[PDB]
């Protein structure tokens, strides 16, 4: 439901912000926790017949894995902002 994904999206955002801070300065712990939350967000979207939103959650889970090995500093910031932007959209609406 929307109330459940809103709560989980806020906690996923706290992981993503902490990881972005680590990248620009325990990352495996925050990333593993981030993956678990986005897995559950995708399942909650799948149960609510929002396949596109669930596809976004699965995409963000893969982006987080790529962020630890992405060479481009400009692409690292784009992927981090893209993850944060989507999570804030789930929290707002």
């Amino acid at each position: 439901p929307k109330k459940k994904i809103q709560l989980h999206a806020e906690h996923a955002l706290y992981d993503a912000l902490m990881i972005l801070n680590i990248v620009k300065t325990k990352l495996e712990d925050y990333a593993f926790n981030f993956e678990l939350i986005l897995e559950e967000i995708a399942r909650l979207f799948e149960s609510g017949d929002q396949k596109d939103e669930a596809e976004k959650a699965k995409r963000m889970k893969e982006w987080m894995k790529r962020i630890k090995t992405t060479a481009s500093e400009d692409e690292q910031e784009e992927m981090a902002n893209a993850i944060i932007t989507i999570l804030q959209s789930w929290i707002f609406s």
Binding site: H11, M18, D29
Partner: protein
């Protein structure tokens, strides 16, 4: 309070510590098994008597004190097993949602930064507070007169993250005692932290 089993209550410090207390023919040894659904590990501890009909256990889930061992979507099955004549017998089995059973670590490092004849500013530090719940911190302090009771004391609420209070209307040359506690009211399903170690201070004489 735990949902599946009735008499067992477990609390999560929002980092890596889960503490369970059992409220009670009676065998010698009993243990507490915890296994998360998302995590492959399985943690165990032995119950020890604290007071009458109360047995406690401490599941240390991490290597660091500030390590985030559990998440909001985690769900670990807490089982109570007691050794009998034939061996381990499952006494209780229950589900446990960690961020719905939050009891943070009591505030520490209480000290007075300024003290007047009537004014006083008291600080305190916090530990083992998750980034998941850190912005939702809330504080409650109680000020009592020396010799009086803590139930008689006046409890002051800081519904924001302040970690200090400036006290006014204090009697000169008078000794007070203060305790503080902390909570995170995201969904208000968690309970208050224990009171801090009391801080005794006396105002400047008139």
């Amino acid at each position: 309070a735990v949902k599946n089993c009735s008499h067992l209550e477990c609390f999560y410090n929002s980092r890596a510590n889960v503490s369970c207390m059992w409220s009670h023919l009676n065998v010698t040894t009993c243990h507490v098994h915890a296994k998360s659904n998302l995590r492959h590990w399985n943690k165990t501890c032995e119950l020890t008597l604290v007071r009458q009909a109360s047995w406690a256990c401490n599941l240390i889930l991490g290597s660091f004190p500030e390590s985030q061992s559990l998440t909001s979507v985690d769900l670990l099955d807490i089982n109570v097993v007691c050794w009998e004549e034939k061996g381990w017998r499952r006494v209780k089995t229950c589900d446990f949602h960690p961020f719905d059973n939050l009891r943070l670590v009591a505030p520490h490092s209480l000290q007075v930064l300024h003290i007047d004849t009537q004014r006083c500013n008291i600080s305190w530090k916090v530990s083992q507070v998750s980034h998941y719940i850190e912005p939702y911190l809330e504080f409650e302090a109680r000020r009592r007169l020396l010799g009086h009771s803590w139930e008689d004391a006046s409890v002051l609420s800081l519904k924001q993250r302040q970690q200090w209070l400036f006290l006014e209307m204090l009697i000169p040359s008078t000794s007070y005692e203060v305790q503080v506690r902390v909570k995170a009211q995201r969904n208000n399903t968690g309970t208050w932290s224990p009171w801090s170690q009391p801080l005794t201070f006396r105002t400047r004489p008139a």
